[PDB]
């Protein structure tokens, strides 16, 4: 999420949370094999649909309701 | 060894296709320089780089 | 004697939400079947404008082809 | 033509500087909007 | 983390922490030189190591311990 250090010395950060058997896109640096980099965590459709309350079908997010 | 006496043509002479100044060996591309150990240590000749400045050859090696 | 005559009816549009201003749809308008069984496609032959604050509306579709498929 | 280096005066075309903006409404987009 | 604007018309999103010095991913529109965008932040192998507190080695994340 962030990561620094402060003026005084002290480093300050974050540490999301990690799961396995979860499925990550992967950047390879100057497009080398053997160079992979994480970009972010992409969930499956049942799992997104299962963490969800929202009933709606679609719809523009400019409606009131 | 062969003699002349067994030549029927040649084509022989220098170029300057191949040209560089800077050789190093760089290890497995994985490592990287802003999150870890020392990335690559190359090497020149003073006099070689007035002529072909910072002329670099780079050669990943999976073994190091 | 009368050639191929084609093949229309009525198809109902069903909206996520009712209506917030007074949309349209062109005349040719296609229309298909996800159904493998019945490719064929429709289209329509007249405009027709949603009214604002509606919430469904009924238009006439043509076949584009014309015999036992339509 | 060999006077001061004119050339050839076909060279600057009637369609040379004659031109204008592009924009959408010339093939397609303009067929849904007769209203 | 998020952005974008409500049916009344007032603009909302979040300002995530930005720090000086942190390594940061960047990919390059059509792979054009001269046309850089951040994708997230990365820290070090020490950062990471100072900021959690877990003191497992290794092992697989199904295990109840």
């Keep these: 999420s962030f990561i620094g250090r402060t003026p005084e ?12 058997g979860s499925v990550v896109l992967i950047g ?6 053997n160079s992979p980099i994480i970009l972010s965590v992409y969930g499956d459709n049942e799992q997104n649909k299962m963490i969800n309350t929202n009933p709606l079908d679609g719809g523009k997010f400019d409606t009131e309701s | 060894k062969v003699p002349t ?49 910072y002329t670099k050859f780079e050669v990943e090696n999976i073994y190091l | 004697k009368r050639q191929s005559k084609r093949a229309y009816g ?8 009712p209506l917030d201003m007074r949309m349209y749809i062109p005349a ?12 064929q496609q429709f289209e329509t032959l007249v405009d027709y404008y949603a009214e ?13 082809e014309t015999g036992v498929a339509g | 033509i060999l006077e001061d280096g004119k050339g050839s ?17 010339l093939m397609g987009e303009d067929t849904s909007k007769e209203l």
Tied chains: 1, 5.
Excluded at chain 2, 41 to 46: A, E, L, N, S, V
Excluded at chain 3, 10 to 17: G, H, K, L, M, P
């Design chain 1, 9 to 20: 010395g002290s480093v300050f950060g974050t540490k999301p949370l990690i799961t396995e």
């Design chain 4, 9 to 25: 005066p076909h060279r600057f075309a009637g369609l040379w500087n004659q031109s204008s903006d592009f924009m959408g409404g």
């Design chain 2, 5 to 53: 006496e067994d030549f029927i043509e040649e084509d022989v002479g220098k170029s300057d296709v191949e040209t560089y100044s800077i050789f190093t060996a760089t290890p497995a591309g994985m490592l990287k320089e802003l999150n870890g150990d020392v990335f690559s240590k190359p090497q020149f000749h003073p006099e070689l780089t007035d002529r072909y400045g």
């Design chain 3, 52 to 64: 604002p604050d509606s919430t469904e509306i009924v238009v006439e579709v043509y076949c584009k």
């Design chain 3, 10 to 17: 009525d198809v109902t549009i069903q909206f996520y939400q």
């Design chain 3, 28 to 39: 040719g308008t296609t229309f298909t079947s996800t159904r493998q069984e019945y490719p």
């Design chain 1, 28 to 33: 390879f640096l100057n497009d080398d094999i």
